[PDB]
């Protein structure tokens, strides 16, 4: 056998989301003691009172924060067996495939993280090809819901289509019975346009997750609940522990059929204009993050009610929902049919926190270790080899430590076409 020196290349993946994600490297010595977590403050909002005499009406100050942490390493541990009859070129190709797979995994975690805590939900009762300009309507709906909430979009926006809906948009553009520049490009190439409906970057991603439908039905809030913005709370020891502003646990009648990534909306709660506190016409959309216990779930947008009388004015300044939960409001489930998700966000909402693995220390002698810079994704890991002389074998390991964080789940979104019945 003389294996010819040619290679039949098979796969070619692209990682646009991991490339567009901003990457953060906090100090390692501090992170080790702080347990791989770090807190960042949140843009401050202040109350306002109308009147002349305000004796005993002076409010305080409140500044909230979020916490970003890290997960666990991602490896390609593999073995150089002595009884293996394979070539050195094959191990080289395995290292290359390891790099490609690590980049793909980073992109997959980014996509799933965004699609599972995207608070803004833009649903459509029919598919994208059903009506003319339906893809543009779908994109403009997300743009409008992002503008109405007065969410910051200074760094930029992004809208990732799944390939099928991208093809549907291209079909919609090509069947126009008229050719200008946009139809001409949608014909010659596949691209619809780079900027659509106000988004400054509209792409197509092949690794977008599919949000499976939820079997949940007949669910209501059990007990009137009130969530108050706060920066720290007292523990049993008497120490003030910081509170993550991006989570709130609601008590429901039964959390059967709910999972991570489901989108819900209580019947009666409306969005607010954040800064101006003007009631919107769109029902507030929440995303369930974790189903803890059989009667509790964790929703990522904290429903700070405007009409809550239990809120001190500085806390009420952070209101984003017109009313509160009233022990009876039925919660509707926005996702009703399996559908691949188109994902839109603001470019500052998703980040990647990266840490080094100091396997280059003098404590790790014997093994030989170097860095391992992944291209495409802007990440670095370690690559180490060791040799066992008792069995005349060796081991190789490519480790990579990182964690995908969503600092502003209220900015990430999910588009769900064809969610009828």
């Amino acid at each position: 056998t003389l294996a010819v020196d040619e290679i039949i290349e098979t796969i070619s993946a692209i990682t646009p989301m991991a490339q567009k994600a901003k990457k953060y490297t906090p100090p390692a010595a501090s992170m080790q003691r702080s347990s791989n977590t770090i807190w960042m403050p949140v843009e401050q909002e202040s109350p306002t009172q109308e009147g002349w005499d305000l004796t005993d009406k002076a409010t305080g100050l409140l500044e909230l924060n979020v916490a970003v942490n890290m997960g666990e390493p991602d490896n390609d541990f593999f073995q150089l067996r002595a009884d293996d009859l394979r070539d050195e070129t094959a191990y080289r190709r395995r290292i290359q495939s390891a790099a490609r797979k690590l980049a793909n995994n980073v992109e997959l975690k980014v996509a799933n993280m965004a699609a599972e805590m995207g608070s803004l939900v833009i649903t459509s009762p029919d598919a994208i090809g059903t009506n003319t300009a339906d893809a543009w309507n779908f994109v403009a709906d997300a743009e409008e819901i992002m503008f109405s909430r007065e969410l910051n979009r200074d760094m930029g926006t992004s809208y990732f289509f799944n390939p099928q809906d991208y093809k549907k948009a291209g079909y919609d553009l090509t069947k126009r019975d008229i050719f200008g520049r946009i139809p001409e490009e949608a014909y010659r190439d596949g691209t619809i346009q780079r900027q659509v409906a106000g988004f400054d970057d509209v792409l197509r991603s092949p690794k977008l997750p599919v949000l499976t439908k939820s079997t949940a039905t007949g669910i209501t809030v059990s007990g009137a609940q009130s969530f108050k913005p706060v920066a720290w709370q007292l523990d049993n020891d008497g120490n003030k522990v910081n509170v993550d502003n991006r989570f709130a646990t609601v008590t429901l009648s039964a959390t059967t059929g709910m999972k991570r990534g489901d989108k819900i909306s209580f019947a009666g709660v409306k969005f607010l204009g954040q800064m101006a506190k003007n009631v919107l016409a769109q029902d507030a959309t929440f995303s369930v993050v974790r189903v803890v216990d059989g009667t509790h779930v964790e929703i990522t947008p904290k429903p700070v009610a405007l009409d809550d009388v239990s809120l001190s004015p500085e806390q009420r300044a952070y209101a984003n929902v017109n009313t509160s939960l009233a022990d009876a409001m039925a919660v509707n489930i926005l996702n009703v049919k399996d559908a691949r998700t188109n994902v839109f966000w603001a470019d500052d909402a998703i980040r990647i926190v990266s840490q080094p693995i100091p396997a280059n220390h003098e404590l790790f002698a014997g093994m030989k270790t170097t860095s391992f810079s992944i291209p495409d994704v802007g990440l670095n890991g370690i690559f180490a080899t060791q040799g066992d002389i008792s069995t005349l074998s060796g081991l190789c390991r490519i480790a990579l430590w990182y964690g995908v964080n969503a600092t502003r789940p209220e900015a990430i979104g999910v588009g769900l076409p064809g969610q009828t019945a």
Binding site: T25, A29, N360, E362, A365, K368, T370, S371
Partner: protein
């Protein structure tokens, strides 16, 4: 965005890019300096004989002596169309501050490292000297770098032998406790916080190193356009260009002295910044140092690129296999000599029963006796006497010892002569001359020569500090390679003698002889001879 993370990413990329070459060079250094039995697996419960019968070291000594007998040093020569003696002041400064023992020792260390491992280096630094300053109360001195292969890490995107296109370079310092304490004292660092960095060593079991402390200096060169001021010199009246960064704190003092600004231009130039870093924090951020180039000069042996990968080789790499074979065969033969039963007769006990003392080795008998009869077998069986075979060295052992020695002798021939290595050293010295010229222009007081004397135009600020001023007509001399001379007078003596050796016996020969006597040193009789030569030279017009 993080400066620490940017520096660390750059250093890590370079460290992994230069991994194979560094390990090979360190292995060569170990083989040629410490031991030829570099067994990093030893685990010998039963200790066996491992000799060291060296045949490569004489070649290394010969190469070192050959390349030491021919010193090489920078020679500055005036450019095309410049003043004929535009390089005299720079040559004087260079010979003045590069005559010390440190420069020669740094060059020799780099040379030996080049010959053995494949790469060496040295550094150029500037210091404040108050007793014997070279110029402007400052000196430039050349310091050595040991194990440059593992201690000096260059930009991986460099395709030049001398690394003039590298944009950054990391130098790792390992020092004792006292050394770290006073390094921190010198650089205003905190001695309580012990720093750490990448340990440039991995030899595992039998290599015993010292508990030291590691830090890094990260040099980066940035080329950018910066403002320059075009003044009118009060004396000469010619337009002079001064860098705004250099004359920032004497802007008003220049006008007070009488300099009137004419215009303002933007001239592109390079600046060098040093950062003191550890593995977890940055101590000094961007301390701007003198010059246009990184102050580290590397020297390479057999240097090249294979596949986007830099490889340098010395003289020891290709002899290692043959030398190791020779050592193993020699140890095997020594074992054969040591543990091998000697030649002695084979006896039955009953053959010599009773005559045991006749065979012990004494010489008190005229013959040896044997028993003949047996009480049961009647007569002892006849069997010719046999002896244990003498130890022998196998033909395979002898043939392979000879072949390994022949292979090492054939492969340990640098060139035909060390011309390639000497030219590589000359290239390193030319780069050193470039760096020194830039540093001199940045910090030293360079007089300007006029055809109407040497003018030194400087001024002081309100803080009593003097800021040197250099015109932009500065690169008036280029760099070449010539013999090493301790002083300009010795260089002039050598030039005069070289002219004399070729000038025929005419009147120019008399002129050159008088000039040589003029440039001679001083005693009493030689003083009178030089005075007579001066008198003759003056009287001859």
């Amino acid at each position: 965005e993080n400066r620490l993370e940017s520096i660390l990413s750059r250093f890590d990329a370079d460290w992994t890019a230069s991994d194979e070459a560094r390990r090979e060079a360190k292995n060569d250094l170990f083989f040629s300096r410490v031991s030829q039995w570099d067994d990093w697996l030893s685990q010998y419960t039963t200790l066996q004989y491992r000799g060291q019968f060296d045949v490569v070291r004489p070649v290394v000594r010969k190469l070192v002596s050959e390349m030491r007998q021919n010193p090489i040093d920078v020679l500055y020569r005036p450019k095309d169309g410049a003043r004929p003696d535009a390089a005299d002041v720079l040559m004087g400064m260079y010979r003045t501050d590069m005559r010390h023992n440190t420069a020669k020792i740094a060059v020799n260390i780099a040379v030996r490292e080049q010959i053995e491992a494949g790469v060496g280096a040295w550094r150029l630094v500037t210091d404040y000297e108050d007793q014997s300053p070279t110029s402007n109360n400052q000196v430039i001195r050349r310091e050595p770098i040991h194990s440059a292969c593992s201690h000096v890490i260059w930009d991986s995107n460099s395709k030049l032998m001398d690394k003039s296109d590298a944009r950054h370079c990391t130098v790792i310092h390992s020092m004792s406790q006292n050394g770290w304490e006073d390094f921190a004292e010198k650089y205003d660092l905190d001695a309580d916080d012990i720093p750490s960095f990448q340990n440039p060593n991995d030899w595992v079991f039998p290599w015993l190193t010292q508990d030291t402390i590691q830090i890094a200096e990260f040099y980066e060169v940035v080329e950018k356009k910066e403002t320059a001021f075009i003044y009118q010199d009060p004396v000469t009246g010619e337009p002079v260009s001064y860098f705004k960064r250099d004359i920032k704190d004497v802007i008003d003092d220049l006008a007070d002295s009488g300099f009137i600004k004419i215009a303002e231009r933007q001239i592109k130039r390079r600046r060098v910044y040093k950062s003191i870093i550890t593995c977890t924090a940055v101590l000094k951020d961007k301390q701007l140092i003198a010059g246009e180039h990184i102050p580290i000069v590397p020297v390479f042996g057999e240097w090249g690129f294979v596949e986007d990968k830099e490889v340098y080789e010395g003289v020891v790499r290709l002899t290692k296999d043959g030398q190791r074979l020779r050592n193993m065969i020699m140890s095997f033969n020594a074992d054969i000599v040591a543990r091998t039963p000697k030649k002695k007769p084979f006896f039955w006990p009953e053959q010599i029963a009773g005559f045991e003392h006749m065979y012990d080795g004494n010489d008190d008998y005229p013959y040896y006796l044997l028993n003949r009869t047996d009480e049961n077998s009647g007569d002892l069986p006849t069997q010719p006497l046999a002896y244990y075979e003498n130890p022998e060295v196998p033909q395979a052992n002898a043939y392979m010892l000879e072949a390994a020695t022949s292979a090492v002798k054939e492969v340990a021939t640098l060139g035909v002569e060390t011309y390639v290595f000497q030219d590589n050293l000359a290239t390193a010295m030319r780069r050193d001359g470039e760096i020194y010229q830039s540093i001199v222009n940045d910090i030293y007081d360079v007089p300007r020569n006029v055809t109407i004397l040497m003018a030194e135009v400087v001024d002081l600020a309100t803080g009593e500090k003097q800021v040197l001023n250099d015109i932009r007509g500065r690169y008036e001399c280029y760099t070449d390679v010539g013999p090493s001379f301790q002083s300009m007078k010795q260089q002039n003596r050598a030039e005069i003698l070289e002219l004399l050796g070729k000038t025929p016996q005419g009147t120019p020969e008399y002129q050159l002889l008088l000039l040589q006597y003029f440039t001679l040193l001083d005693g009493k009789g030689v003083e009178m001879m030089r005075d007579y030569a001066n008198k003759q030279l003056i009287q001859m017009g």
